[PDB]
Design a protein around this ligand. Sequence first.
Ligand SMILES: [Ca+2]
Ligand SMILES: [Ca+2]
Ligand SMILES: [Ca+2]
Ligand SMILES: [Ca+2]
Ligand SMILES: [Zn+2]
Length: 316
Amino acid sequence: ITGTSTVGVGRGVLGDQKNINTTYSTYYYLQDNTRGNGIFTYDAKYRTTLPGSLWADADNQFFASYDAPAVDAHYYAGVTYDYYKNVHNRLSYDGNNAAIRSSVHYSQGYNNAFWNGSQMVYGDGDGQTFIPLSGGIDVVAHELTHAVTDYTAGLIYQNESGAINEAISDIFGTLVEFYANKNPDWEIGEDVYTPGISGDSLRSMSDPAKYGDPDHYSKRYTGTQDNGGVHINSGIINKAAYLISQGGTHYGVSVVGIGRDKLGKIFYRALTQYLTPTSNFSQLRAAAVQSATDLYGSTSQEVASVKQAFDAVGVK
Ligand SMILES: [Ca+2]
Ligand SMILES: [Ca+2]
Ligand SMILES: [Ca+2]
Ligand SMILES: [Ca+2]
Ligand SMILES: [Zn+2]
């Protein structure tokens, strides 16, 4: 809507207080005009009809329990936008400042979040497996990254290309978590997963096997479930990304880490310049090697580490 830009205050899913950009026009709306064509957050009101109603508040104060998921979805979308703009010089997910829209309170006891091709959607969780999903910055970044992938490489959501699609979202979801310096780690969804159990997460990039996911190509899932194991085989790529950044010895192969910043630069270039809709793991390796070559030279330590990491996970 058309109004005056202002700043409100609220509390997120985890009970933390934060300032959020709103717009005033009779009501205060969750509309951030400071980033691109705007960030809009909607109330799905426990229904499945999208996007729902643009979030309206009477006093610009968002401390109600019902407000929490909206505060975080709105705020973290902003952080993710800042990451892509400041670190990769990319304006929104389409590179042309497309408006970012998110709907919260989707359905009832919905343990999932997703990009539906046009916007982000967040369930509130069942309170046992998950609490409102927008409470996790890596979750929000994971979802917004699916949009970036759709507008760039366009990786098909099936089999190996789908696993790469998933890994890319976990990788950048994690880099954004580090960017915001919000208790950063190489785990996925730890902030909103199983509130009754501490120390766990949905997936682990440092050690995928911890939750039963493969950490080597020889252990890849070949079945038909989960679109060919897109959320399972992503572990192979996640492990490779972790090794490239942090280094380590995996299955007898030693990798010298080059850090998170270079990891981001290498994968972002691969994603936007070399990957295609049907790229498989082997092609991802080639794309990553070429990207590192473009950025640091064919005889650089960076290229060496990328090669070692993929060798470690059995991807030739
Ligand atoms: Ca209020
Ligand atoms: Ca964390
Ligand atoms: Ca995390
Ligand atoms: Ca937990
Ligand atoms: Zn995903």
